[PDB]
Amino acid sequence: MTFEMDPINEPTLLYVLFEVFDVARVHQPHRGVIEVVYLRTPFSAGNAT
Amino acid sequence: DPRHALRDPERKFLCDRTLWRIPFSSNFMSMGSLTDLGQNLLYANAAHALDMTFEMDPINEPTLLYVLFEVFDVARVHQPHRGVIEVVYLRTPFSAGN
């Protein structure tokens, strides 16, 4: 994807943000232990098995 | 000489460029990176707090301690597709997030 916009003298930065599907699941097994998992389906920082 | 003037010993040692080491092992030996302790249930399954107390010789100008707790600082680098670089950092005994 490419953008062309009006030119302004001061340097600027584009703020395109991809609408990922970000969701976290919280499970608390027992007595003060908390463990969560994260999933950002289009742009994720995942892990192997 | 026969004309000596008494005697009073005073001994000392001068160790330079050395970090004093106190390994977290039961026998203080170095028989593995994942030590004897820090792996059993007593110290790897419950909560504990240190109360380390240092007594040291006085110095006129201000000084500062350099206690560095030896930890497991590891990184894992994954390169899936031609310019994608993803790295996982994990510092075990002192957590540093993901």
Partner: protein, 33 residues
Amino acid sequence: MDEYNYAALAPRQGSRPMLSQWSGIGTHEMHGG
């Protein structure tokens, strides 16, 4: 046997290529002293 493994890449010593030991890959250097 040179078809089931990378033996042509390793330098030879006559007819037997000089491969490393299997438990040679990997390293671990770590101490605070």
